[PDB]
């Protein structure tokens, strides 16, 4: 059902994560980790202390889709096992901030065509698909977006609930 999912999303905060390539989202799904630039790392660390759940909703640029969503399980941390992210332009791995641990809630895709009715008040009421990496999504919009995703039968939210 959807009941444990709704429980995890209660009073949560939501952030749009934009990746320029599928490889980094695949790494995140395999390893349960995410890394972002320092401006967003600061916002996510602040958010993690402020709310019972912080949800990252992932979208690969030019894919026309979201690739899933996950809950922060930690603040960012440095010096752990390295992650071979695929970086753009000429920025190096040092420019990327710490590493957040994440628990996936849904690893299934959702096409943008299915979220066309959802607008984000925190981005001028543009469709929720529109937003820079790190854009916060208002509570009601973020909750409804997460509930549009196909259920991911491989994930048991029992252990997620216990970390809250």
From the list 80, 38, 64, 34, the residue with the least C-alpha distance to 127 is: 64
Backbone angles phi and psi of 145, in degrees to 5:
-60, -50
Cα 109 off chain centre by: 13
In whole angstroms, give the CA distance from residue 138 to residue 141. 6
What is the end-to-end Cα distance of the chain in Å, rounded?
Answer: 20
CA 106, chain centre distance (Å) = 10
Structure tokens at 28: 């995140």
Chain breaks in the chain (C to N over 2.5 A) after: none
Resolution of this deposited model, Å:
1.5
Q: Which residues contact 59 (CB under 8 A, 6 or more apart)?
A: 16, 17, 18, 19, 65, 66, 67, 129
- Pick from 30, 52, 29, 45: nearest CA to 78: 45
């Amino acid at each position: 059902g959807t009941s444990k999912l709704k429980y995890v999303l209660q009073d949560a905060r939501f952030f749009l994560i934009k990746s320029n390539n599928h490889e980094n989202v695949s790494l995140a799904k395999a390893k349960g980790v995410w890394s972002t630039l320092p401006v967003n790392e600061k916002k996510l660390n602040l958010a993690f202390r402020s709310a019972r759940s912080v949800i990252l909703i992932f979208s690969v640029r030019e894919s026309g889709k979201f690739q899933g969503f996950a809950r922060l399980s930690s603040e960012s941390h440095h010096g752990g096992s390295p992650i071979h992210w695929v970086l753009p332009a000429g920025m190096s791995a040092k420019m990327l901030g710490g590493v957040f641990k994440i628990d996936w809630i849904c690893r299934r895709e959702l096409p943008f065509t299915k979220s066309a009715h959802l607008t984000n008040p925190w981005n001028e009421h543009k469709p929720v698909k529109i937003g820079r990496d790190g854009q916060e999504i208002e509570l009601e919009c973020g909750t409804q977006l997460c509930l549009l995703f196909p259920p991911d039968e491989s994930i048991d939210l029992y252990q997620v609930i216990h970390k809250m």
